[PDB]
Scaffold this active site. Structure first.
Site, PDB file in Angstrom:
ATOM      1  N   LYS A   1       1.009  -1.368   0.013  1.00 24.47           N
ATOM      2  CA  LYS A   1       0.092  -0.201   0.077  1.00 24.47           C
ATOM      3  C   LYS A   1       0.848   1.103  -0.038  1.00 24.47           C
ATOM      4  O   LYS A   1       1.407   1.527   1.020  1.00 24.47           O
ATOM      5  CB  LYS A   1      -0.968   0.048   1.209  1.00 24.47           C
ATOM      6  CG  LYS A   1      -1.732  -1.125   1.436  1.00 24.47           C
ATOM      7  CD  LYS A   1      -2.844  -1.442   0.217  1.00 24.47           C
ATOM      8  CE  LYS A   1      -3.745  -2.616   0.831  1.00 24.47           C
ATOM      9  NZ  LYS A   1      -4.972  -2.817  -0.240  1.00 24.47           N
TER      10      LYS A   1
ATOM     11  N   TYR B   1      32.450 -10.771   1.856  1.00 20.58           N
ATOM     12  CA  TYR B   1      32.014  -9.234   1.893  1.00 20.58           C
ATOM     13  C   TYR B   1      30.404  -9.264   1.926  1.00 20.58           C
ATOM     14  O   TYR B   1      29.733  -8.232   1.518  1.00 20.58           O
ATOM     15  CB  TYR B   1      32.596  -8.403   0.865  1.00 20.58           C
ATOM     16  CG  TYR B   1      34.169  -7.928   1.009  1.00 20.58           C
ATOM     17  CD1 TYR B   1      34.395  -6.944   1.925  1.00 20.58           C
ATOM     18  CD2 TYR B   1      35.102  -8.766   0.710  1.00 20.58           C
ATOM     19  CE1 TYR B   1      35.868  -6.775   2.080  1.00 20.58           C
ATOM     20  CE2 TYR B   1      36.412  -8.674   0.899  1.00 20.58           C
ATOM     21  CZ  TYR B   1      36.734  -7.390   1.778  1.00 20.58           C
ATOM     22  OH  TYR B   1      38.218  -7.608   1.929  1.00 20.58           O
TER      23      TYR B   1
ATOM     24  N   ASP C   1      15.213  -5.199   7.333  1.00 20.26           N
ATOM     25  CA  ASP C   1      13.783  -5.836   6.652  1.00 20.26           C
ATOM     26  C   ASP C   1      13.855  -7.414   7.166  1.00 20.26           C
ATOM     27  O   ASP C   1      14.888  -7.979   7.512  1.00 20.26           O
ATOM     28  CB  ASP C   1      13.800  -5.904   5.163  1.00 20.26           C
ATOM     29  CG  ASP C   1      12.458  -6.028   4.467  1.00 20.26           C
ATOM     30  OD1 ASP C   1      11.951  -7.280   4.122  1.00 20.26           O
ATOM     31  OD2 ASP C   1      11.931  -5.173   3.945  1.00 20.26           O
TER      32      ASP C   1
ATOM     33  N   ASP D   1       8.445  -4.597   7.819  1.00 20.82           N
ATOM     34  CA  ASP D   1       7.906  -6.159   8.095  1.00 20.82           C
ATOM     35  C   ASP D   1       8.625  -6.898   9.047  1.00 20.82           C
ATOM     36  O   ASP D   1       8.182  -8.108   9.339  1.00 20.82           O
ATOM     37  CB  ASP D   1       8.000  -6.659   6.736  1.00 20.82           C
ATOM     38  CG  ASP D   1       8.923  -6.705   5.782  1.00 20.82           C
ATOM     39  OD1 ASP D   1      10.172  -6.352   6.483  1.00 20.82           O
ATOM     40  OD2 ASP D   1       9.117  -7.061   4.666  1.00 20.82           O
TER      41      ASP D   1
ATOM     42  N   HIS E   1      14.455  -6.432  -3.271  1.00 17.71           N
ATOM     43  CA  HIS E   1      14.519  -7.655  -4.290  1.00 17.71           C
ATOM     44  C   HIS E   1      14.688  -7.556  -5.523  1.00 17.71           C
ATOM     45  O   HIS E   1      14.942  -8.786  -6.346  1.00 17.71           O
ATOM     46  CB  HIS E   1      13.176  -8.178  -4.004  1.00 17.71           C
ATOM     47  CG  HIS E   1      13.005  -8.879  -2.509  1.00 17.71           C
ATOM     48  ND1 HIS E   1      13.775  -9.454  -1.932  1.00 17.71           N
ATOM     49  CD2 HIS E   1      11.800  -8.665  -1.641  1.00 17.71           C
ATOM     50  CE1 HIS E   1      13.117 -10.087  -0.727  1.00 17.71           C
ATOM     51  NE2 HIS E   1      12.221  -9.230  -0.580  1.00 17.71           N
TER      52      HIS E   1
HETATM   53  N1  LIG Z   1      10.877  -7.062   1.347  1.00 22.26           N
HETATM   54  C1  LIG Z   1      10.246  -6.033   0.783  1.00 22.26           C
HETATM   55  C2  LIG Z   1      11.160  -4.611   0.507  1.00 22.26           C
HETATM   56  C3  LIG Z   1      10.691  -3.621   0.219  1.00 22.26           C
HETATM   57  C4  LIG Z   1       9.539  -3.857  -0.744  1.00 22.26           C
HETATM   58  C5  LIG Z   1       8.822  -2.689  -1.490  1.00 22.26           C
HETATM   59  C6  LIG Z   1       8.910  -1.310  -0.617  1.00 22.26           C
HETATM   60  C7  LIG Z   1       8.679  -0.016  -1.685  1.00 22.26           C
HETATM   61  C8  LIG Z   1       8.045  -0.429  -2.915  1.00 22.26           C
HETATM   62  F1  LIG Z   1       7.680   0.670  -3.478  1.00 22.26           F
HETATM   63  C9  LIG Z   1       7.943  -1.701  -3.476  1.00 22.26           C
HETATM   64  C10 LIG Z   1       8.522  -2.700  -2.805  1.00 22.26           C
HETATM   65  C11 LIG Z   1       8.921  -5.119  -0.875  1.00 22.26           C
HETATM   66  C12 LIG Z   1       9.213  -6.172  -0.108  1.00 22.26           C
HETATM   67  N2  LIG Z   1       8.615  -7.442  -0.268  1.00 22.26           N
HETATM   68  C13 LIG Z   1       8.146  -8.329   0.806  1.00 22.26           C
HETATM   69  O1  LIG Z   1       8.133  -8.045   1.896  1.00 22.26           O
HETATM   70  C14 LIG Z   1       7.657  -9.662   0.356  1.00 22.26           C
HETATM   71  C15 LIG Z   1       6.319  -9.813   1.187  1.00 22.26           C
HETATM   72  C16 LIG Z   1       6.081 -11.249   0.969  1.00 22.26           C
HETATM   73  O2  LIG Z   1       5.703 -11.385  -0.397  1.00 22.26           O
HETATM   74  C17 LIG Z   1       6.893 -11.431  -1.288  1.00 22.26           C
HETATM   75  C18 LIG Z   1       7.624 -10.038  -1.022  1.00 22.26           C
HETATM   76 CA   LIG Z   2      17.064  -8.221   6.006  1.00 28.46          CA
HETATM   77 CA   LIG Z   3      29.903  -7.589  -1.468  1.00 32.65          CA
HETATM   78 ZN   LIG Z   4      10.377  -7.461   3.487  1.00 34.85          ZN
END
Ligand SMILES: Nc1ccc(-c2ccc(F)cc2)cc1NC(=O)C1CCOCC1
Ligand SMILES: [Ca+2]
Ligand SMILES: [Ca+2]
Ligand SMILES: [Zn+2]
EC number: 3.5.1.98
Length: 368
Positions: A25, A216, A170, A258, A135
């Site tokens: 969101k 590293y 995270d 999270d 990711h």
């Molecule tokens: N770990 C992580 C860190 C950043 C963002 C994210 C933040 C801002 C944005 F605009 C877009 C993405 C999304 C995730 N994904 C999940 O937490 C998981 C949750 C379980 O399902 C797989 C992904």
């Molecule tokens: Ca982490």
């Molecule tokens: Ca490295």
């Molecule tokens: Zn996450």
């Protein structure tokens, strides 16, 4: 002492929508902004609107074909790109939604702008809560992330900094950031995360880097239900040892929320104070610092967490009584800043935490 803080926000960020039922969101960034404005924290920092990052900026890491796809793909033309959607991992967890590319430009813009500000020595801290998309891969969306703002920001810092330290609190493994820098000693990546039957499946403590990057990459795998006490007793020792051995001249801290207690998709038990203790620890080293967002799916707690961590960055004490704001009803029934942990079992025993710490200490002795 006190440090100059530059903060990046675009008021359009809250209007982007992943679609019905999707737990990401972008509204949570607006909630964060509105809460910290209502605490008066704008009085103590410079608020900047990020530029929309260009295809030139994004292709410093990502492939030309992947960025071209992100620039082209829309809900109205999805049937025409059926092959590329599969190739680039778009259309399911990473859906096509209206203004997807502009959303990538905004989140990326804040992180790279912050990096430039730090390189120019015009701020001590740069904050982009819309960033931390750890990711995203070179030619692949993953885990709700399309463009890796972190990798791009680190590449910016590497123009002026020989060694950059990346720290990731995270709940998920910082796999895209680790992969990008896996074969270099110029970025040390340190991820603390849930490991075992959990996304993205990587970040075993035996993953230590490769080639020139061997030793590293640092991974601290954790079980369900870690609490403030257990986290705090390993975080400062690990980061202190990393600072001692690696001696970075800049730091990027991904503050994914999270890992908080009560997160819709997480199973950790950190409070806002426990989460924010990590910011306090990193800040004591007095290095140029880029603070970024990340995950967080119980959006009231995300807004609390990043508001408090902005206050920590400013050395500003703020009251636990929440001020009135545009989203005041989201913070019921208590209307307080700080959260209580749940009664969930901490599967991370004190012996486990110390044992994993000692194995990472062995690996840190292999640095020159
Ligand atoms: N770990 C992580 C860190 C950043 C963002 C994210 C933040 C801002 C944005 F605009 C877009 C993405 C999304 C995730 N994904 C999940 O937490 C998981 C949750 C379980 O399902 C797989 C992904
Ligand atoms: Ca982490
Ligand atoms: Ca490295
Ligand atoms: Zn996450």
């Amino acid at each position: 002492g006190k440090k100059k803080v530059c903060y990046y926000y675009d008021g359009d960020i809250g209007n982007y929508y992943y679609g019905q039922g999707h737990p990401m969101k972008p509204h949570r960034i607006r909630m964060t902004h509105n809460l910290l404005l209502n605490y008066g924290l704008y009085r103590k920092m410079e608020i900047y609107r990020p530029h929309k990052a260009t295809a030139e900026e994004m292709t410093k890491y990502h492939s030309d074909e992947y960025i071209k796809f992100l620039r082209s793909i829309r809900p109205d033309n999805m049937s025409e790109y059926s092959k590329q959607m599969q190739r680039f991992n778009v259309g399911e967890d990473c859906p096509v939604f209206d203004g997807l590319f502009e959303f990538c430009q905004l989140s990326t813009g804040g992180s790279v702008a912050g990096a430039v500000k730090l390189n120019r020595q015009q701020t001590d801290m740069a904050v982009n809560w819309a960033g931390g998309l750890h990711h995203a891969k070179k030619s692949e969306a993953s885990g709700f992330c399309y463009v890796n703002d972190i990798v791009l920001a680190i590449l910016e810092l590497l123009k002026y900094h020989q060694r950059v330290l990346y720290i990731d609190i995270d709940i998920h493994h910082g796999d895209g950031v680790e992969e990008a820098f896996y074969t270099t000693d110029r970025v040390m990546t340190v991820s603390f995360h849930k490991y075992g039957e959990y996304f993205p499946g990587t970040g075993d403590l035996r993953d230590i880097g490769a080639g020139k990057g061997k030793y590293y990459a640092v991974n601290f795998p954790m079980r369900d239900g870690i609490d403030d006490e257990s986290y705090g007793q390993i975080f400062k020792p690990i980061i202190s040892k990393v600072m001692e051995m690696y001696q970075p001249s800049a730091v990027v801290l991904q503050c994914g929320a999270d890992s908080l207690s009560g997160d819709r998709l997480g199973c950790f038990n950190l409070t806002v104070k426990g989460h924010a203790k990590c910011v306090e620890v990193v800040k004591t080293f007095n290095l140029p610092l880029l603070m970024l967002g990340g995950g967080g799916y119980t959006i009231r707690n995300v807004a609390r967490c990043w508001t408090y961590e902005t206050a920590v960055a400013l050395d500003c004490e703020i009251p636990n009584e929440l001020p009135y704001n545009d989203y005041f009803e989201y913070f019921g029934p208590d209307f307080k800043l700080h959260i209580s942990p749940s009664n969930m079992t901490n599967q991370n025993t004190p012996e486990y935490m110390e044992k994993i710490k000692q194995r990472l200490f062995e690996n840190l002795r292999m640095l020159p």
